[PDB]
Amino acid sequence: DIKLFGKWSTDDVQINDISLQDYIAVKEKYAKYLPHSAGRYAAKRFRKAQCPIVERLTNSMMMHGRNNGKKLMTVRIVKHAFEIIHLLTGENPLQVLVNAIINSGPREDSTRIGRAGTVRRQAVDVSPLRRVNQAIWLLCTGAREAAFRNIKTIAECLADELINAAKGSSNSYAIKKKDELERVAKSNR
Amino acid sequence: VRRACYGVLRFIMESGAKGCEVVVSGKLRGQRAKSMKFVDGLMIHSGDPVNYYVDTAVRHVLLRQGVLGIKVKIMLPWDPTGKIGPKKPLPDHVSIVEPKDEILPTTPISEQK
């Protein structure tokens, strides 16, 4: 019905945990034909919670301070990486992306005001909006650092970290920081 | 200076105004110079109405000990509505006009004309 980029039908993707069912933004109710709209989403809260997840990607990869208006860079790179993924695993790049999102979203952090042990004092759970926010940020920044001094363009970096996180491989920088945050929090329990 | 400014304040008030402000600056007798402000009545301070309700003037007085700074600020009562007092009264004056009795509690009454 919506044929994302001429393909990748929305009514295929399955999200696992119902603490995220409503908080991933891939589904048909708001299935955009493309991740781009000046929709005043960040004006008030919780609209960006509904902002399509691919739109969040294209708006988050657009972050270095050198590139600051090149959203079209972002959509072209994400479309290329989506094509790359659908080539890599045959299944929906939307599906692999949501899998990486859930598998790289942390749950435990440390935050207090007292004398911090290693990061903070008290371990604390995270609500699944800062969780997915940090997850997509981590994916993006992994892609950026990976393509910084490599011949690989950001398209393939994003693709490979997306696969690595979705499967879970202890090699993508995203999950490699996720589990360290989780375990240092467990130490500061 | 006090007697003179009180006299001018008297005369301005009898001229009829919502208020006034006068400030005298400079060095009086003695070498330490400080101002001293005489006020009466109303004195709006902020927003557009000051541009066309209060008028101000600054004059420098060539005194043997130096110079005297004089500020005067009079406002014009609105009521003339175009005369020496300007029209468009201050917005906090939407005055409630008062009906008549408008009771008429009698029976339905017909008068033909």
Binding site: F46, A49, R107, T111, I113, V124, D125, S127, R131, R189 | -
Partner: protein
Amino acid sequence: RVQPIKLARVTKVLGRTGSQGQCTQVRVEFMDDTSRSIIRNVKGPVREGDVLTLLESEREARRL
């Protein structure tokens, strides 16, 4: 041995804490012992009435 990951609906929030807004009291329930709920501090937006993952139930309980 380790307590399983458990889900947690969030009811009315008591309010922020950490004297910076960094944490908030949430009153979660495990949708199975629905008559048992626990006070709990979380970070990030709460979206009153949403649901949250949880590893260890009996972690903390402090009243402001």
